[PDB]
Amino acid sequence: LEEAPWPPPEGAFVGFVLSRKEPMWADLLALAAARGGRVHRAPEPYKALRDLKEARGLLAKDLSVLALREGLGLPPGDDPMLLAYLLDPSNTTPEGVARRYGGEWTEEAGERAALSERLFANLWGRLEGEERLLWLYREVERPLSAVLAHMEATGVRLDVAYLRALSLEVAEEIARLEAEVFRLAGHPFNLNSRDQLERVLFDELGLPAIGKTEKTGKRSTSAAVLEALREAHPIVEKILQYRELTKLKSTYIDPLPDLIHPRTGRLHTRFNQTATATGRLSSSDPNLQNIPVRTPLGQRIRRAFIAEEGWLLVALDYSQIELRVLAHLSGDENLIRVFQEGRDIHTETASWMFGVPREAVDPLMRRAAKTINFGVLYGMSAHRLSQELAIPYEEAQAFIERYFQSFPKVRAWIEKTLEEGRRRGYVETLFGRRRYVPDLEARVKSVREAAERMAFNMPVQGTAADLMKLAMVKLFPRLEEMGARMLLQVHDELVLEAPKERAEAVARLAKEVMEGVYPLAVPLEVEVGIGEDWLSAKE
Template identity: 55%
Template structure:
């Protein structure tokens, strides 16, 4: 006869199932039922059942509200939503536990923690040890020399460990939690009292009641802690009520007994239905006393495709695509012919190119033409000083000068090379643009060549030219009518507009930017010193590992998320932002990060990228990067200069107008919301835009049922957040965090939003259904984005695909509209002596002669507003100023 168990293993069923859900990649049975949480749970369970001295008891939260939820409705409201496919797996786990023959407890009105607390006390009363399997730190109040918590890495944690890590005893744990709170359970604590302060106060005064008494009689030090506790006193008491476990429930269970026989037939049927053969083997090995590790489950291949970086993004062998106009590389024959193609010209050998004199260059005052003249002059001098014999295969310049367009893969990059050297050649047909319209995953010629010709992209000029021609002939017929129109009416003419914008550049006030960099550097040093003071010692703030140790080990801040690859506690901005109010080191650290990034990305590099001949910065606009059709900006990336932060906006002061000119900024106002109203067909939202209403105030009024004139600032802010957030799949959890409101309020707001605007829910549903059927979604103009993730069995991948799918038609149509406006504006602006300089998201930056600024502003506004005919009007805001900042 087996001896009676001497250790009660108390498993928090929901906690272990939740942990198992994220520990394994998504897995399904043959019938498609998710099983990864079940598999992970059973692997841990069989490990714990292996020891015959263990009495394993599984405890679950009941399906009804608990007494804590009845007392405090916002209890645990801050928790992330349970994954939609987890509850069904938990029900399966319940059934398997019963069939195995283990005790399973659920007590209505009480949480699993309370049942576990009672069982731990019962185990001690029977002379047993107890091991608690949970992720809830409230269980630390139960710890004794006989009661331990089993951590996720299978280490036992006892009273001494709590004292060492947190600086408080087990008997002080509830008091400690009452002061610090717990964001995961929405336990408020005392606002502003962090772990170190709470620990210090309890070490000095022993109990929470004594700390409160000292605060009330004015003797508690420091003064700041005293004021924070008194200001949060009701929350402190509330937190203590929520944190205290019940340990005296009347449970009908016999301790120190082995598992029952269970129901083998039901167990076998369950494991067969769920295709959990490895679990069956583990359980059979348990019965035979030969349990071993299950065979690891291979992680399924991701459906997300990796596309190699475009070759032109990195200067490299042979050709440098995306040429930096701030550099003065010589124009070689290999570069010139790297991707040009013509069915009547055969190129078979390396070629040299020596420009001949041009007598026809016009002299103007524009910076780009001044550059042309100087470069052409230098080339003439070189040609005269060092005449070269004409080599085999020499290309006569007339072959290019006589052409208006150059056909090439990456034609715009090649055309800008020629333009800055005085050759009036524009980008023409481009197979890369065709490939991009076929599938926006086609962002680089090496990938396109491999995909459609099953050939490597050659390193030699002649080979590249030949493959470019083949790809043109192959891919053009594959475009449907809508995408042919996109090519000929938008992408090809846009490449010519962008080439001119790249060559023009934009004038920078380099002295201002260097001064701003110096001031920012001084602020960064001050912040670094503050961070060291908050940490209590000097460390490398830029070291991820050192920062992790300071934040989570030394300061004991809550760890919200771990990185997927390493499992380490995240120090990314997204993980730190929710901790902003937890400790003063966090806001200092976030500001330090922001300033360091701005300085390193923009302020220091940009003055060095100014072309010395033009005094202007020449960025490169990439047409084939973003899957939505939006333009990207490279070297430097001007699209990412932040405009929401004051510091980011300061950088825009460094972009200035040429003497005699002013800058005009024209920005589509709320274009994505207007497109959402049009495409969704929601009549209420359309009516708001048609009547010129404040859409955010109108939304708040409609959703909350208040008079529009009485909408508060907070209510309008919430409506604005949801209006824009719905396009990106904003969850109630995210809205709760962003607005600092209870989760229930955030969830209710989103529900009422879709009830108010049913057309938007209909649009999302229609778009997802179309995407699942056809494999792609598209803009109003027929631009496609393929979304294979929509039918993924991986829930995380699938939901990310859904957000992409219903966002793309809106964002992609906005991109198409501003491209149309740019094409229509190009020649009329030049006729007025004005020039388009930059395109950033929904904004155009134009340089206009001072005497014609009003006329230019009127032209730009009218053209942009008329770029598309929708059921709601497009609105454009135009501002002007001597620099980009002052145009707003």
């Protein structure tokens, strides 16, 4: 391209280079723009940002987040990554997309700007005639990138002092556990090494190996294996407790306080828009979509996520979302009827599981039943089912047969979905988001059947994902108008932050927006809570 002075004209595509991948932490090393056979390189990148009306190009959101960080209201616009991701969700990296659609991802901003321009041209062309994918781009993905930029730049408050204190307490208990484990082993070793632990359990102590690891075929020391060995030796329960504590300390308690941003005083994640096979978002650096909640210590950690002083967190979560979606997709009368009657399948399974009346089911019981309900739906084996329920194999098989015999059109929907995936080479969500599954025609059964589980899951998980994205796009401007903030998405959950005076109004509004986003054959129900911290807001 012909080199030309900064600034570029309107509609130009940007290229940019960051010192590190995370936009909230990155130095803007270079900035350029391309349009009409010209490339414009900015002598001073930060100041040059002010000249742009929008960030149009590869990874547009990252530049937008950096702009917002610097106090500049620069929205992201067209991004070839989003076009490519819709065409084929295995398109996840600029490296791959460039290679596939007409160029090379290099480390020079001008080259990135020029690449953005031509990739957009090519990809836009491939989306001609693809009316449904075009709709998803214009109505969902492109607007959502703006919403996500604001969420990333906003961050969430964390009680750092609390976590520091908690680390010390957890360290002392970890020391107790490891010392006990070493005593029981008769000698110290690296308890963080599963290789060393395997030898202790299975070679030194008398314990029977139960399972093998996937890639290298070592004797597994996974939680499932240790659970089954709980009564065989006192060391097992001690290892399980050590694992829980060290996992939580090493992954959350210790790293998170170190990641508070010096300017904002908050914790900032990345919401990756082109990262999953189904259309879900992912979260990284740090991942805020896997903050603990199941165990007592996990709950103590989740409580560290707090509202700003004078504000409250609002948490909203779609009820039984994939089951409702499945009802719509399959058109099963029985399942549709369940939701029209305001029933709860998770609670019902739980009452059966623990052998108590439906009223006796506590949240932890219901949560246990969730894994069982979705596990069975998406192809869990009776053996695993019997194992995790500690019921005879015969009981497990019986639960699975009744699970499906109750809802006839579900299996039919599955069969049709798989048959159609074999024919077209892809499956699709309600809105037409696609996932290619070539292994549906694999000649190897285990490979083929794994592919089948991936394939029929995708329309369900993906439709739920599409619905949440659409809801975020609708909700965001309403929140802006109310002075509320959208902070996090966790798949079928949103966490907002609202001024205390407006918190109740915001909760009601958000619930209605989420429930009314795109009506299905069954009602969408959203549960909502309000609190000073993430845990309190979910109760």
